[PDB]
Design a protein around this ligand. Structure first.
Ligand SMILES: [Ca+2]
Ligand SMILES: [Cl-]
Length: 162
């Protein structure tokens, strides 16, 4: 069990544009195209990400390339954020996966705004963080995509994915 298998399970796989639990336009393994309300703007974003006229549909290899790019962006996003990085570096191995997963889903900006959760995580207050994350818009809006992540922050094990 690793970050890639963990996100695969949480985000699954869709080969045609859809609206995720936040209501935004998306394809592959949780690849967000745009926050614009316009399907056609998302449609361009897709051809642009892939390098061909798609059309709203992609292959498995292409989804996995996108997936790898998106994991990579999520880790880079953490390390370049002055708020996330020191909290990330205090975390043990398994919790770091939960942290990458949380950013992959929520984006850097969303995660970094949960100021107190970040402090609870840094002080290793696992129970409180998980309670305060279980209140978030993310959890209520995206409960099945979030549940295993939140449980993982509490326990620091992989049991939620087994
Ligand atoms: Ca690391
Ligand atoms: Cl969900």
């Amino acid at each position: 069990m690793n970050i890639f298998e963990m996100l695969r399970i949480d985000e699954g796989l869709r080969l045609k544009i859809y609206k995720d639990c936040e209501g935004y336009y998306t394809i592959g393994i949780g690849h967000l195209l745009t926050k614009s309300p316009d399907l056609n703007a998302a449609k361009s974003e897709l051809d642009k990400a892939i390098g061909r006229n798609c059309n709203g549909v992609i292959t498995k290899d292409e989804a996995e390339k996108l997936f790898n790019q998106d994991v990579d962006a999520a880790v880079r996003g953490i390390l370049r954020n002055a708020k996330l990085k020191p909290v990330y570096d205090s975390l043990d191995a398994v919790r770091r996966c939960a942290a990458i997963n949380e950013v992959f889903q929520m984006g850097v900006t969303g995660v970094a705004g949960f100021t107190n959760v970040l402090r609870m995580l840094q002080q290793k207050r696992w129970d409180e963080a998980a309670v305060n994350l279980a209140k978030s818009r993310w959890y209520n809006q995206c409960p099945d995509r979030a549940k295993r992540v939140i449980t993982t922050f509490r326990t620091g094990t992989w049991d939620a994915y087994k």
